[PDB]
Symmetry: C2
Subunit: 527 residues, 2 copies
């Protein structure tokens, strides 16, 4: 029952969590029915793709274009919440190759990289699924999360609808491992989509392709030591740590309490994943699909191309939609990809400025709550603004991860950063939303954007140690063509051959006279 | 400290077992030295095989013949004792394809098939290596074990020198996972070899080829989640349950306390197994090598042919020696085998009567102590005698497994069966030792053997409901050519064309007048 979510550890009278049905019980009651229902959905998907514009082929899917709303959005919120939020930890030195830290991998890595921590803090008898009842979500207010996104200046919201251990934020007909059956006992994704739609936030559907473990029905026994000859555990390469592939032996006392709620199938992809995706799309009508966890199986074999075509086709002539690039390797036997935009993770890297892209990260290294995170290891508001503008100037969006604890509460450090960014965007948003890169992006610590129609150039000034700005080939319309967003203060400037030389007004030498203390923005009418 | 070995469960104040060195410490201190020492041993082995009669080739090894002493022995004792003896359990329904039950697989299957039992009875925090201090061996008297083998009528003794988790009954220079460092704190194999030699028992060296897990040194990291980039866990297919092959990621909090004492190497076979085998052979000068655990790697790749040639070669001119057939599949890339005799396990199956073979089993299904075993699920003395004679008549030896508890004490049920068999053999042993199959083996519940020279036929009579024995083509020498071992009672008989008809003396109708109550034996001087 009781833990402090801000310093989470084993409760004093921990009892094991047994879902009303174990995995064999779920097999005996639900598997056949689920597999029949899945067969029907697959036929529906095939027909929609038959009738529709888009076919499950790269050639066909690549012709879909990034919508204007996505290019114009610039800022999204990535709502990284789930059972992993309860322990809310990754240890020092366990960073991924991205450079990020992954508390949101705790459910898997508790038996591996994070096991020393788990053994001492939670106990060796505390299983993955024991976290599910502890994810009560009593401070999780879906209305306030949508409002916070708005107040942060975000134009889209992507909750972690279903991550790699298979727990769905929505009430599903294809799994009892869902938010109504387990944890907060409410349809969290439904609350969030309703809260988002009534605020004009675009809504993204985050969907893990593979899962770390899934119980499957087999035609032969895996080994002679197995209690069941008709059942196994399915893996692909998603977990990165080598496991038996495709099948591991199934042992109830080992597996049941890391797969609570999951109904066995013969075919993980066809019988479970495909219809679960369809259900999410059909129920929630997302504007965006954010695939993840598809590096373990080629997109050809996982059948994600059919899901991508479906998503496009059920939207055609209703709304413009977009998909990320994480469907997996697209082969025709590195590989190629499908999807509308690249998703560099934590570290921006070398980006192609010609095509819109999206970086995902939180204000710290953490993907998922880390209870040890605080002001000193997180971005300052100043650093966040600076980082955001740099992203936008280079044709990117920021999908800003936020990391609530097991109660669903967001730390003040994270709240304050979001509200400071949003308050900066309230003033300077005209130089951000619906902008495109200019022929210069960054110069002398100043950042440039242009309005998509080309009438205005914006210059974001973040450093109070500045007096003159020299901009080659700016070409202001007339001597009154330069102003400051959110201010009446007149900007004096002169041309000097090709270079425009701007003197910062006297009052703006001190950043307490700025409309917003984290930066001011010059608006330049050009032509 | 305290458990009841006859009903073993988690001690009351269990503390974790940490060997003075963990796996990284063993790597830093000992690995280099071990790998240099291994290099020297490998050169020694290569030279011995270079200069010697036998080469590491099937053609060469197959020319070695089963020694007369093995064919003449008939009965051996298989001393199945180790860390697994402490928990002393396998659950119902977990039988191998052999039909046997394997408490001696507990160390592995505690995380798999036997995990339900282990979780409730020992606890999820109780690791494999926690059993090692509990194997105190305070009732393990090596002198009495050798004497018991003699009193059972056994001619050879095969202790479980090293089983699949790698714990050596001898003090080794190639592992700290040995009987002196861990468990009874004495050189158990040394005690047993000395006790055996002074009783003229032949001595067998039981040696597992593969182990379930071994820490190995790598040239690159297995996954990005690994704490060490220079280390992994090596597996082959020996465990049967699929594992990552050849390498799994290594995690100290997961692995260290199932591999206590084991010094990491680059090459499991070359750097560890080969020199450990050599050490055992050189130190103990065994008459017999009993390989096991070689079905996970072909004999070609494990390099066991070189060990077989070595063993033969270091014995040439000193003693006649023998090897079983469990080196592994012999290929030249359904496969062939090397070794001197077949080893059907638990169930005899279809045997080739033309070549000597050996069946291994205990008086119950169990390989390894099962604390729930008792009189009612074990062979009676009568059934054991009957089973033994059937084996011998078909050209087999019985390698009779005995199963002590964690204190090293053997159950009375097991002791009584052995003493009854030995007492039957004391009387009737002339019809067993140094015998060969006759043209009839079993007929009408009677069993036949012949002396190896062909002078005598022996007929073992086990059922008191018998008055006449009719034997085709038994040609007795003269009218006084038939007697009863251990008795002066005259045996009357008549020929009737091809058939010899023997009347059982009046007194022998009741089995209380038999020299031994479990059977009497006719001795027939023939042509
Ligand atoms: Na495209
Ligand atoms: Na041979």
């Amino acid at each position: 029952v009781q833990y402090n979510p801000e310093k989470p550890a084993r409760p004093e009278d921990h009892k094991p969590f047994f879902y009303k049905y174990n995995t064999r019980q779920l097999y005996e009651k639900f598997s056949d029915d689920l597999m029949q229902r899945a067969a029907n959905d697959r036929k529906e998907i095939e027909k929609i793709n038959q009738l529709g514009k888009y076919k499950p082929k790269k050639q066909s899917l690549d012709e879909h274009e990034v919508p204007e709303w996505f290019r114009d959005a610039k800022l999204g919120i990535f709502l990284d919440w789930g059972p992993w939020s309860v322990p809310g930890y990754a240890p020092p030195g366990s960073e991924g190759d991205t450079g990020g830290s992954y508390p949101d991998w705790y459910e898997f890595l508790m038996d591996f990289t994070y096991k020393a921590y788990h053994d001492s803090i939670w106990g060796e008898d505390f299983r993955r699924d024991d976290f599910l009842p502890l994810l009560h979500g009593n401070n999780f207010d879906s209305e306030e999360y949508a409002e916070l996104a708005v107040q942060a200046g975000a134009k889209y919201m992507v909750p972690f609808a279903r991550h790699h251990a298979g727990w769905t934020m929505w009430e599903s007909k294809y799994t009892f491992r869902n938010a109504v059956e387990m944890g907060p006992k409410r349809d969290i994704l439904k609350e969030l989509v309703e809260a988002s739609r009534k605020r004009d936030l675009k809504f993204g559907f985050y969907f893990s392709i593979a899962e770390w473990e899934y119980p499957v029905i087999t035609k032969e026994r895996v080994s002679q030591w197995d209690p069941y000859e008709d059942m196994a555990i399915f893996h692909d390469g998603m977990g990165l740590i080598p496991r038996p592939v495709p099948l591991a032996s199934y042992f109830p006392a080992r597996h049941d309490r890391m797969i609570s709620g999951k109904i066995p199938v013969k075919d993980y992809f066809g019988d479970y994943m495909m219809p679960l995706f369809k259900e999410g799309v059909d129920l929630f009508d997302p504007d965006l699909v954010w695939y993840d966890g598809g590096w373990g199986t080629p997109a050809n074999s996982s059948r994600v191309p059919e899901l991508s075509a479906y998503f496009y086709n059920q939207a055609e002539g209703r709304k413009e939609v977009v998909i990320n690039n994480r469907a997996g390797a697209y082969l025709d036997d590195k590989a190629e990809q499908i999807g509308d935009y690249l998703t560099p993770e934590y570290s921006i890297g070398n980006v192609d400025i010609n095509e819109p892209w999206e970086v995902c990260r939180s204000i710290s290294p953490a993907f998922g709550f880390n209870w040890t995170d605080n002001e000193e290891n997180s971005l300052s508001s100043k650093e966040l603004v600076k980082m955001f503008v740099g992203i936008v100037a280079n044709n990117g969006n920021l999908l800003l991860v936020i990391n609530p604890d097991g109660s669903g509460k967001l730390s003040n450090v994270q709240k304050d950063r979001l509200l400071d960014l949003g308050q900066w965007l309230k003033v300077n948003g005209e130089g951000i939303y619906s902008t495109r890169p200019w022929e210069i992006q960054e110069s002398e610590g100043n950042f440039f954007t242009k309005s998509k129609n080309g009438e205005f150039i914006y210059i974001h000034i973040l450093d109070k140690e500045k007096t003159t700005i020299e901009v080659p080939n700016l070409n202001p319309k007339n001597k009154g063509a330069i102003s400051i967003l959110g201010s009446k203060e007149k900007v004096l400037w002169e041309n000097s051959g090709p270079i425009t030389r701007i003197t910062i007004p006297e009052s703006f030498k001190d950043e307490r006279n700025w409309p917003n203390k984290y930066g001011f923005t010059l608006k330049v009418a050009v032509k």
